Amino acid sequence: LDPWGAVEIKDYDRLLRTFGIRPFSEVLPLLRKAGMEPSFLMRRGIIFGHRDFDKILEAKARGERVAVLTGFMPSGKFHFGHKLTVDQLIYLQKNGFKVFVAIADAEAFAVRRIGREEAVRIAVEEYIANMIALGLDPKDTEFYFQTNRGTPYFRLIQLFSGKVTAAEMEAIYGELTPAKMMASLTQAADILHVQLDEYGGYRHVVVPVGADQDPHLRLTRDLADRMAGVVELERPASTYHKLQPGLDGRKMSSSRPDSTIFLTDPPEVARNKLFRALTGGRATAEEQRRLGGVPEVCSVYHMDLYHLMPDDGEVKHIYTSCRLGKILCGECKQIAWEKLERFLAEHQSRLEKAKTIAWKLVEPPRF
Amino acid sequence: LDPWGAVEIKDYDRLLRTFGIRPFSEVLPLLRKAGMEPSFLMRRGIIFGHRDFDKILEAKARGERVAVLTGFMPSGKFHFGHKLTVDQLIYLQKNGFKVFVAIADAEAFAVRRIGREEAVRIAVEEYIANMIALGLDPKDTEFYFQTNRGTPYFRLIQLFSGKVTAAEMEAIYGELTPAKMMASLTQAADILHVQLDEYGGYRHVVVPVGADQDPHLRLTRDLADRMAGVVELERPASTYHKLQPGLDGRKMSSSRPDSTIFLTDPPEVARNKLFRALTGGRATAEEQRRLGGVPEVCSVYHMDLYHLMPDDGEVKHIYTSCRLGKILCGECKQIAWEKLERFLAEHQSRLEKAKTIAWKLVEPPRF
Ligand code: SF4
Ligand code: SF4
């Protein structure tokens, strides 16, 4: 009975310590003092790492307003990969964090070749509207476009350009276009700019990411340090989540629709995707009942663990049964489906109103 | 009697035609129709080339407000190299052109490592104050800082990053840092942004440069073309001036003080620099009187031609005498000095008031 899977953690949690990334449990006593109980993603070890989130919670504890920031590429549809990020935002927002969400429409245009009108449409109706329907507060959340964020944010990007080398950027990105160079600096500015007085002066900011995104964060932290004497910036903190494996064994992508469920999928499309998902199940009903299934490798069990079963007892019960022989994939799938069906229907019923609201939460760029 | 020196023109004027650069004389009939008489720099062939300045003058002729734009690196002192640019601005401004001057303080910081406070000080007291004392109108001239120019200008730079390759930039600049990549895009935006409605909508803009600056202009023109469908931009026009050779035979630079006269040089410093200048004169007073001097190679004669003698008769008289044997360098130098002395004293007496005014012509960036 290891339902949370500490085993696969410990392995790289050794190597990430090299980058100053720590086990998330080291912040529990601070979470408590900050008046916060861990979210289920934290209890389950899905949020496994942090860097400097202690410093964030210390500020918060003494009454400082703290912030969380992330951004989204407005391309393709909003999926459960995206949902995992937003749920961390919602948890922090309910605990008093100021939330910033950047729309990466400059990067969309310049790196991904996405048209202006479409980037803006997708951002508002597919990203912001889904985040609102998920529960991000339309009034206190500050959404913005990279291309419409104002002089002091843009100044950072200009000044950061003097404080990084081609080689440092080549390390992070590989072979490096002007667009990618520009994207990299703008993203550091997305993270750091909220510390400027013109955007609220939030010195203490945490960014929720996957380990695979740390190199850009370390660059952003170096930029903050290298700006000493020009503008005073604190190194941003972070939390680290394991990435949810896709329904087809590979990473969730709008690119391959069967990898993931889109939050706008009609019930029949979603069910079919779910019933097609890879499992840790066996050759036949019969072999399953003798040995059991393998949840550690099962994408249905991961849907349960990351989204569909917030109750620890329910998901443990699924883990145990699967292993103990007591359950077949077909039934397991139908159980996850019924959680999914209800979440989708409540979600989609909020979505048309969220779209109306979304267009009023931002000023889209003129061109 | 070739005092204007067409000879050295024709040579490369062949090769620059490859880039679509034309002899400046092809625009005379348009200059006339636009209600403008050529400036002495134009009469003397010092402005030798143009690209698309016909299209500018056609707009102007039908009553459109046309613009000229250039920018300055706020580093070192304002010299007669800089003065030659500003005098072209002043001529255009008197003929109804809107003038924009960019201060390249982002490039100063990121490429040249110049501090923020100092870039800003130097820009205002050394560059803008000297331009005002020279006669640039403090009320109608729009001076701005790269780092303080606003969202729509910055958006261009973000979008341009998707429309140029590392190789195209490598061609212009050599090995290419993030700062240089950033400088190159910002400079295109300096030129193009005035076409946006938020900055006055000046579609028709001419940039006065030396031939050696054309590659960046061709890139800026390509960027305008490549933005079709995103923002409608006209290819900027240009005029081309020969560079004034330095007093020490080499190019004018704040780097080597004896190369040039600074507009703030006290009369004794300036005279000494002038009396030290390289000439086309001879071994001794005696050999000079037989053969003559060589004005084509003489940096005193070039001071006369570019600044000190706006009257064509006076400078021709210097050319002829020098050649005909009638004048020695010592006397020639003292004649140029007396023009210089008077120009400096009138100029410096306007400079303290221009400094006061200058601080009110711009909003310096916060950091
Ligand atoms: S019974 Fe459920 S947890 Fe076990 S392998 Fe099948 S789908 Fe996965
Ligand atoms: S006489 Fe004048 S123009 Fe002739 S070489 Fe001497 S300084 Fe130059």
From Swiss-Prot, chains A, B:
Gene Ontology MF: a single term: ATP binding
Matching Gene3D superfamilies: HUPs, Tyrosyl-Transfer RNA Synthetase
Major subcellular location class: cytoplasm
Motif residue range(s): 'KMSKS' region: 251-255
EC number: 6.1.1.2
Region (Disordered): 242-263
Residues spanned by motif 'HIGH' region: 74-82
Source taxon at top rank: Archaea
Composition-biased stretches (Polar residues): 252-262
Biological processes per GO annotation: tryptophanyl-tRNA aminoacylation
Alphabetic keyword roster: Aminoacyl-tRNA synthetase, ATP-binding, Cytoplasm, Ligase, Nucleotide-binding, Protein biosynthesis
GO cellular component, one term: cytoplasm
Cell location: Cytoplasm
Recorded catalytic activity of this chain's protein: tRNA(Trp) + L-tryptophan + ATP = L-tryptophyl-tRNA(Trp) + AMP + diphosphate + H(+)
Pfam families: tRNA-synt_1b
HAMAP family in the record: Trp_tRNA_synth_A
UniProt similarity note: Belongs to the class-I aminoacyl-tRNA synthetase family.
PANTHER family on file: TRYPTOPHAN--TRNA LIGASE (PTHR10055:SF5), TRYPTOPHANYL-TRNA SYNTHETASE (PTHR10055)
Protein name per the record: Tryptophan--tRNA ligase
Lineage: Archaea, Thermoproteota, Thermoprotei, Desulfurococcales, Desulfurococcaceae
Gene for this chain: trpS
